[PDB]
Nucleic acid binder design. Sequence first.
RNA 1: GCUCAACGGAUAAAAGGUACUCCGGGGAUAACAGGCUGAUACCGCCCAAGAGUUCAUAUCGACGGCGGUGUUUGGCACCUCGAUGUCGGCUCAUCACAUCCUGGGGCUGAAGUAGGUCCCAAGGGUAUGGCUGUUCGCCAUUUAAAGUGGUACGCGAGCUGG
RNA 2: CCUCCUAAAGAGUAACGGAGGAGCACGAAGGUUGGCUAAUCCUGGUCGGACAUCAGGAGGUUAGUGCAAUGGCAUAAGCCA
RNA 3: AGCCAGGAUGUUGGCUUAGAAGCAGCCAUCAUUUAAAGAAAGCGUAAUAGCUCACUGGUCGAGUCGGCCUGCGCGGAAGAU
Lengths: 76, 38, 94, 96, 136
Amino acid sequence: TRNGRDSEAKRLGVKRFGGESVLAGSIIVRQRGTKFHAGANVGCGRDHTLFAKADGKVKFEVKGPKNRKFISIEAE
Amino acid sequence: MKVRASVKKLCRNCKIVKRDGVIRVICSAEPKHKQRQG
Amino acid sequence: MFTINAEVRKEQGKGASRRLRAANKFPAIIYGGKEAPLAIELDHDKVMNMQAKAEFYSEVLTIVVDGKEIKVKAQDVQRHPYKPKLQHIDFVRA
Amino acid sequence: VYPEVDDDIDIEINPADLRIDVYRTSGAGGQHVNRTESAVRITHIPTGIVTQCQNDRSQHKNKDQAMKQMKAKLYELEMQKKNAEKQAMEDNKSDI
Amino acid sequence: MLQPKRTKFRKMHKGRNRGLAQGTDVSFGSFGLKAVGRGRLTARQIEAARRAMTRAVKRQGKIWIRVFPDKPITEKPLAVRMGKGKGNVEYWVALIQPGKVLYEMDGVPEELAREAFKLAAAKLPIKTTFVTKTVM
RNA sequence: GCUCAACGGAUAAAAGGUACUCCGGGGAUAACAGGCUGAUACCGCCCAAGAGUUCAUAUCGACGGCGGUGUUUGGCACCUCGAUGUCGGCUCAUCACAUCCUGGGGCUGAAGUAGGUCCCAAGGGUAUGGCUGUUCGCCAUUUAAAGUGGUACGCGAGCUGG
RNA sequence: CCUCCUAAAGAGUAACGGAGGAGCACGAAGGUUGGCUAAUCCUGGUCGGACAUCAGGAGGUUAGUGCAAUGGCAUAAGCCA
RNA sequence: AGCCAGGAUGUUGGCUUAGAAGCAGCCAUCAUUUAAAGAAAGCGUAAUAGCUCACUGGUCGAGUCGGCCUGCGCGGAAGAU
Ligand SMILES: [Mg+2]
Ligand SMILES: [Mg+2]
Ligand SMILES: [Mg+2]
Ligand SMILES: [Mg+2]
Ligand SMILES: [Mg+2]
Ligand SMILES: [Mg+2]
Ligand SMILES: [Mg+2]
Ligand SMILES: [Mg+2]
Ligand SMILES: [Mg+2]
Ligand SMILES: [Mg+2]
Ligand SMILES: [Mg+2]
Ligand SMILES: [Mg+2]
Ligand SMILES: [Mg+2]
Ligand SMILES: [Mg+2]
Ligand SMILES: [Mg+2]
Ligand SMILES: [Mg+2]
Ligand SMILES: [Mg+2]
Ligand SMILES: [Mg+2]
Ligand SMILES: [Mg+2]
Ligand SMILES: [Mg+2]
Ligand SMILES: [Mg+2]
Ligand SMILES: [Mg+2]
Ligand SMILES: [Mg+2]
Ligand SMILES: [Mg+2]
Ligand SMILES: [Mg+2]
Ligand SMILES: [Mg+2]
Ligand SMILES: [Mg+2]
Ligand SMILES: [Mg+2]
Ligand SMILES: [Zn+2]
């Protein structure tokens, strides 16, 4: 057969969920596109990996005219 | 004698009767028509 | 024209509905106008016969529940997938 | 002058008209071969033609091959019969 | 024999056939043959049924085939061991749930239609029933 | 500076044969038989398009459907590798019935004779040769008939060894 | 080695399971600033036609992404300077 | 449900067929005398003829017909010590 191949799993997905207190630099989401968009106090990596730019709690939200998932960090 | 799993009235003259726990079509008119479930 | 007798449903849900169906009854609802929705039970056999007629769906019906004549129209009927049976009927106050 | 006859489709023979025998192979060569009945003899009941096949290990494959062979033989027979009739006709024509 | 013209994919997973059907009511015709049983109609079977019923109705009145064999079934060749990839697509099925209107018919008297459906039914693997057009 | 691509890369540097073989192991794993299974096979049945002058169902039965048997080819690898000897023949058999003959019966597209088909029936019986290691088969000539299967495809601590 | 599915809505998850790709490319196809918005179709228009180039409308990303597939992308990550 | 009676007329509807007269089909499927009678449901014929049936009149004098829903059963159902 011409079929036996598949690539190694990339362990993506949301790493830190809503309300979860994180340190700055902590990766919140590993993702392929901007499935989640960087909101307040969250930075977007080169591979669209969302990470905290400040210490605090993860806050998922729907914002904007295109109704997109935005992850912000709220300070404690 | 047509021994079948399905026995049916093949004409008006065919009558279905049960004899000693066996379904049977007997016919007054046509001898061909007479059947037995088996 | 068609006079149906109903009782107000005590218990609502899936299990309850199933029980009703088992006991040759079937859940139904009256809704429409300023008045709140009213969940009722109906005896299935009686209603099936009524619904065989084409006039059932066209005409105004009268549901008697707790000695109160509620004038309604058949709005939507849920049937059992493979049996001559009724799962549920929606009634609209006319 | 000869008319353009419609080329009739070569009809599929029925399993009712057929006898399929299965048996052990000649010489064989091993333990599994002595036991297994791979060889196939297909026989036409109305005509009396036989086709044997024991080339393959698989009985099914042999049968398929044997079936094909049988079909071919039938075709050949049909052709032969056609030819014979034709031969009669000209012989009669020759007579004139 | 019904089969999809094009396919997104050549082979398909086995899947499961649980649940009730969606094409439940007589939509187009006047009368229908509703599947009571759960199973899977092959393309061949469906075609046979159609043949049975058309003849019965003597080319009078319309027939609809509400089911379509869109799922390919693979069979491994004989005398072949269990490994070595998936088998080849042999035939096509429509997976049938209870409640499936399989066939529909109009432009016929009722009794005749019933008879036709009965004739059809013996060709199909699943237990079936005659059904009618319902207002609502 | 490595298609060290057998890509955690054994060396810088490497095909095969063994039926002349050998050892260590494995029923962890094949060939036989058993087992599970039953696609295939075989045997039934349902529907009835039609063939059968007419007439579906005397006899056949397309397109399709549903079973049984374990019965062929298979699938699996559960049993055995600190051995379960393999086809055929012979000698002995024994059981099943899906009966080949003989017995009883229904229908017949059964005048009779002779058949066809189905039901019941396992009491008894059921070929000799030519060819081939054959089973099978073809042929010769019989016979009331020359059944189909199971039995480790019965039977090698009973024979044979083609 | 990568993408999807199998994979049972976190991650992961096998089979000689079902499908496809990579062993690069680019000194711009990288950076930034400024600007821009696609496919297709209809109508009219020299050569010019189903299909070049020019208009205008419908259309609304059905397009594009240097290449497989998936997820993204108008704030464009797409197209110019 | 038995039982007794009728079960006709134009007509053998034409065609195509070797012949076709309800019954090989192809096709129309009307009207008449009206209690009711199909341009015919089955048997039958070289084909007619003939024998039934549908529907209907008479007798008889109480329930009857066949679908649906379900419970439990029957056949379908053959193997080797
Ligand atoms: Mg529950
Ligand atoms: Mg669905
Ligand atoms: Mg290695
Ligand atoms: Mg390695
Ligand atoms: Mg050797
Ligand atoms: Mg050794
Ligand atoms: Mg074995
Ligand atoms: Mg053993
Ligand atoms: Mg079994
Ligand atoms: Mg068949
Ligand atoms: Mg083992
Ligand atoms: Mg295992
Ligand atoms: Mg061993
Ligand atoms: Mg030992
Ligand atoms: Mg017997
Ligand atoms: Mg006899
Ligand atoms: Mg005795
Ligand atoms: Mg000699
Ligand atoms: Mg032996
Ligand atoms: Mg021996
Ligand atoms: Mg000895
Ligand atoms: Mg011994
Ligand atoms: Mg020797
Ligand atoms: Mg997951
Ligand atoms: Mg999960
Ligand atoms: Mg920009
Ligand atoms: Mg750029
Ligand atoms: Mg039973
Ligand atoms: Zn009869």
